[PDB]
């Protein structure tokens, strides 16, 4: 269960059946070269940092 860093750089949009989540683009600080997409739950500010169990997760994509 490795844990690395991820910080928001682009709020792609809101997803969920009733606006549950935010599909947001996050960069890994330890690599500063990768951008991944996450359906982060909760109010998200552009530039916040969160410790995550996952480093490769993707959700429904459009």
């Amino acid at each position: 269960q490795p844990i690395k860093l991820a910080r928001v750089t682009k709020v792609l949009g809101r997803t969920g059946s009733q606006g549950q989540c935010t599909q947001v683009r996050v960069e890994f600080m330890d690599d500063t070269s990768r951008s991944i997409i996450r359906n982060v739950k909760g109010p998200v500010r552009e530039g916040d940092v969160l410790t995550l169990l996952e480093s490769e997760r993707e959700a429904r994509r459009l």
């Binding site: 860093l5 910080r7 997803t15 969920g16 059946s17 549950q20 989540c21 996450r38 359906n39 982060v40 739950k41 909760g42 109010p43 998200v44 500010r45 916040d48 940092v49 969160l50 410790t51 995550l52 169990l53 996952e54 997760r57 959700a59 429904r60």
Partner: protein, 189 residues
């Protein structure tokens, strides 16, 4: 000096989450002698994080249609158990508070995701703000049920739950809720 209640030092806190001090702050200049400043942060967005978290506590163990409108009681009851954690662990209550907020704070949750289906759930990342909100909610729910109908008074049930959630002990109701959230995140990928 800006010590809490004039007796708990504020120049000793260490969040140790690399970059999270903007979403959990007790050192910030908004941190005042008392956790009472009346409600002004709830109006706008991302201003709730500018709240001194002592205020968020004294308003989160402030609920259930029997307490609303009794905020001075909440400030007295936080002075209580602040001076009690001052002696139970022999350390500043702010340190155990930040430990509780850094461990109880959830990361993975499970939510319904999709535009056309309703069968299962999907794992989601809970943002720092929502994680502190629901962690303080679990803490307050336990502290209410731990002294509900019980001989144990306030400031000790809350105290016990806080101490056994701050060290990462799974015996806490809040930490077992955190474990339940993590396991339901495991079981709904």
């Amino acid at each position: 000096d800006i010590k809490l209640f004039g007796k708990w030092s504020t120049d000793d806190v260490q969040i140790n989450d690399i970059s999270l001090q903007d979403y959990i702050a007790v050192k910030e200049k908004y941190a005042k002698y008392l956790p009472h400043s009346a409600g002004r942060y709830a109006a706008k967005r991302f201003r709730k994080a500018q709240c001194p978290i002592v205020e968020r506590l004294t308003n989160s163990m402030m609920m259930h249609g029997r307490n609303n409108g009794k905020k001075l009681m909440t400030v007295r009851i936080v002075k209580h158990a602040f001076e009690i954690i001052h002696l139970l662990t022999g350390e500043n209550p702010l340190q155990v508070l930040v430990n509780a907020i850094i461990n109880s704070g959830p990361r993975e949750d499970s939510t319904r995701i999709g535009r056309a289906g309703t069968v299962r759930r999907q794992a989601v990342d809970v943002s720092p703000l929502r994680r502190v909100n629901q962690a303080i909610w679990l803490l307050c729910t336990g502290a209410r049920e731990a002294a509900f109908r019980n001989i144990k008074t306030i400031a000790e049930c809350l105290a016990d739950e806080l101490i056994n959630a701050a060290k990462g002990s799974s015996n806490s109701y809040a930490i077992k809720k955190k474990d339940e959230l993590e396991r339901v995140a495991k079981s709904n990928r």
